[PDB]
Amino acid sequence: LNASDRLLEIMRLYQKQGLEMVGQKLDSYLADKSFWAEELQNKDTDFGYYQNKQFLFVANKSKPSLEFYEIENNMLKKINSSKALVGSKKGDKTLEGDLATPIGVYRITQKLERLDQYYGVLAFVTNYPNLYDTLKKRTGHGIWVHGMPLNGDRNELNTKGCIAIENPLLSSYDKVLKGEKAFLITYEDKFFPSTKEELSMILSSLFQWKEAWARGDFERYMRFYNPNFTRYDGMKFNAFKEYKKRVFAKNEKKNIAFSSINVIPYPNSQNKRLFYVVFDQDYKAYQHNKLSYSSNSQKELYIEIENNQVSIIMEK
Amino acid sequence: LNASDRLLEIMRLYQKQGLEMVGQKLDSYLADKSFWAEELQNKDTDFGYYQNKQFLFVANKSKPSLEFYEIENNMLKKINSSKALVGSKKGDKTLEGDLATPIGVYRITQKLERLDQYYGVLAFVTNYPNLYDTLKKRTGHGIWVHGMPLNGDRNELNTKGCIAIENPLLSSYDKVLKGEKAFLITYEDKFFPSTKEELSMILSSLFQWKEAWARGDFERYMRFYNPNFTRYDGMKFNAFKEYKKRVFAKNEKKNIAFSSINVIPYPNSQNKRLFYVVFDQDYKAYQHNKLSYSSNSQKELYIEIENNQVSIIMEK
């Protein structure tokens, strides 16, 4: 019914008004919650939305366990899962030396191999502290996913924060990964999944925010920002709002494109509905029809849904 | 492969590779017979393909009769029909004074309202001789669809070529038209409608021809022209080909777009599979990335399907 009509509309528009208006039409779909609701409806969405192929570790601190997944077309393929050794401290990591495995969403940045035998066949390095941790002034470093001792020793019951699993299993995950980055979701006790409604609200808001930003609609853009907002460099809501008003008043032409978007539910002490959003951004600005600024960057947002409203709490 | 799949593919491509690749994909659909077959499958296609809302008169010289239709979204709504008076001569109109109602596809270009009472309430002026008639060097003029004498006289069984119907019905048609142009399809004895297969072949060919033209593929462009080809200004195939060879050798970049497309079966005395194609064309040419030429024009083609091949027999 509407599939034939939607296609025809695009096809007519392409010939009558050109490819640019086709692009604008497709953008209006990406900004529509009901578009995402339809698009997400038969996807495996519990661990979030993943535009392209991605790999996901999921750690339950309490059990403790480590699961590993392939995600393609937002469909999950569980590779394996085992028991795991974790830090001895419950709740959050906040301080160097505090013995906690952090709770939240992290990134595996690299693989170390020339290690002490304690660490097993390899260590996958997480990015603790992540942006959220950093803006909350939490300290420490060197939280890794690694193996059991090559010594045979199997003395400890608890790590000092790292996550440890059996070495044959670990090497299998490495073989699947093939040097690609992976996400890590670490939670405590119970995991509350991202729903399709939440993802549809976040995704549709993301594209609305982008359109408001690009088109220069100041009041619409600012509405996405939580009054508690912190920018990656420490800037707070009022200074940010002030700076953006000035910038928007220039009315520069801007083309902004997002790609490889991921939206991942962010486990937290208070069970607020927090999400981590990460994507690549191609940003271009113009002055009197000439390119004045261009960048290609990795953007990060932390987003809250509260009282059924989406807001940005942190941005890089 | 269906409309849903095509929409998913377009959006996937836009997200993954951007807008240029989307354009190329849409081009490949427009050039694809099976794409058109899918869009056409549930539409009323016997009197042709019509992108926008149009009005159609259909005249059967033999009966004689006149029908009036509205077409929207390629669905036909019959407004009314009646007997009509027509010219005394059967077959084609080819000469001034030959008393023949022409066979073919015509356009109603204007309404006349200050006429001899013989003509009744109004006359719709047809464009006889049309481009096809003109390039066959047929003569005559002033073929109208008009009413019956206002004094109530009924002293003729035939006109000299005009189509005449009762005044109240004709007024009702004028009220539906509300000043819009209309097409007139006139046939004798039997009407041979355009099939969905024929319209699919013509529409895919039209877009293939356009892209061969725009990209400067001389061989592929030329294959669409019938060896009997005549251009609107009298230029024949050999001079045309020679000229186009030169033009194409320059390798200018061109962007061409077709809109408000109609494809209409063209009744003819030989019962050849002829079609009239009319559309708005946006044409742009560039030299060293600067716009050198632009036009917005009404194009006309007459096309034949013979031996299962589309060919252009005439072009404006």
Report the alpha-carbon distance of residue B248 to residue B236 in Å, rounded. 18
Q: How many CB atoms lie within 10 A of CB B170?
A: 23
Output the CA–CA distances (angstroms, integers) from residue B219 to B57, B216, B229, B245, B310, in the order listed.
39, 9, 16, 9, 15
Task: Identify how the structure was determined.
Answer: X-ray
| From B61, B93, B138, B146, active-site residue | B146
Question: Is A27 in contact with A211 (CB distance < 8 Å)?
Answer: yes
Longest CA span, chain B: 73
Helix, coil or strand: residue A205: helix
Copy the structure tokens of residue A31.
Answer: 């900004």
A75 touches chain B (CB under 8 A): no
Give the phi and the psi of residue B171 in degrees, each rounded to 5.
-60, -40
Query: Any CB–CB contact under 8 A between B5 and chain A?
Result: no
Transcribe A104-157 into DSSP letters. EEEEEEEEE-S--GGGTT-EEEE--S-HHHHHTT------EEEE--TT-----S
CB contacts of B15 in chain A (<8 Å) are 51, 259
Interface probe with B: pick from A2, A15, A26, most Cβ of B within 10 Å:
A15
Query: How far apart are alpha carbons A4 and A173 in whole angstroms?
Result: 44
DSSP result, A67-114:
EEEEEETTEEEEEEEEE-B-BSB-S---STT--BPPPEEEEEEEEE-S
Distance (Å) from the alpha carbon of A28 to chain B's nearest alpha carbon: 12
Residue of B nearest to A20 (CA): B19
CATH number of this structure's domain B35-43+193-315: 3.10.450.50
Q: How far apart are CA A229 and CA A32, in angstroms?
A: 25
SS (H, E, C) chain B: CCHHHHHHHHHHHHHHHCHHHHHHHHHHHHCCHHHHHHHHCCCCCCCCEECCCEEEEEEECCCCEEEEEEEECCEEEEEEEEECECECECCCCCCCCCCECCCEEEEEEEEECCCCHHHCCCEEEECCCCHHHHHCCCCCCCCEEECCCCCCCCCCCCECCCEECCHHHHHHHHHHHCCCCEEEEEECCCCCCCCHHHHHHHHHHHHHHHHHHHHCCHHHHHHCEEEEEEECCCCEHHHHHHHHHHHHHCCCEEEEEEEEEEEEECCCCCCCEEEEEEEEEEEEEEECCEEEEEEEEEEEEEEEEECCEEEEEEEC
B213: left (phi over 0), alpha (psi -120 to 50) or beta: alpha
B316 CB-near residues (< 8 Å, 6+ apart): B131, B231, B232, B298, B299, B300, B301
Amino acid found at B133: D
Q: Who contacts B90 (Cβ-Cβ below 8 Å, separation ≥6)?
A: B61, B62, B100, B188
> Does domain A50-187 match CATH 2.40.440.10?
yes
Q: Within an 8 Å CB–CB cutoff, is residue A10 touching chain B?
A: yes
Q: Are residues A280 and A255 in contact, defined by beta-carbon separation less than 8 angstroms?
A: no
Q: How many CB atoms lie within 10 A of CB B250?
A: 9
- DSSP label of A170: H
| Nearest alpha carbon to residue A206 among A15, A32, A16 | A32
Based on the residue annotation, tell me whether A146 is a catalytic residue of this protein: yes
Q: Which of A146, A196, A210, A273 is catalytic?
A: A146
CA distance A115 to B36: 63
Stated as kind and residue range, the H or E segment containing A306 is strand A290-306
Tokens 């509905």 correspond to what residue?
A273
Q: Tell me the CATH class for B49-187.
A: mainly beta
Q: Which residues neighbour A157 within 8 Å (Cβ) at sequence distance 6 or greater? A: A85
Q: Which of A256, A255, A273 is nearest to A264 (CA)?
A: A273
Look up residue A255 and give its two tokens: 């083309």
Tokens read off for A133:
């941790």
Record the tokens describing residue A22, joined without a space: 């086709």
Residues of B numbered 254-273 whose beta carbons fall under 8 angstroms of chain A's beta carbons: which are they?
257-259
Distance CA A108, CA A160 (A): 18
**Which of A136, A64, A143 shows the shortest CA–CA distance to A102?**
A143
Do residues B49 and B56 touch, judged by C-beta distance below 8 A? no
Domain residue spans in chain A? Answer: 19-43+193-315, 50-187
Q: What is the CATH number of domain A19-43+193-315?
A: 3.10.450.50
B2 touching A (Cβ < 8 Å): yes
Confirm if A266 and A276 have CB atoms less than 8 A apart. yes
Q: Per the structure block, which two tokens stand in for A90?
A: 């419950």
How far is residue B125's CA from residue B255's CA, in Å, rounded to a whole number? 36
The Cα–Cα gap between B182 and B47 comes to 13
Whether residue B294 contacts residue B257, with contact meaning beta carbons closer than 8 Å, is answered with no
DSSP summary character for residue A235? -
Contact of A147 with A63, CB cutoff 8 Å: no
Q: For B284, how many CA atoms within 13 A lie in the half-sphere containing its CB?
A: 8
C-alpha A138/C-alpha A202 separation (Å) is: 27
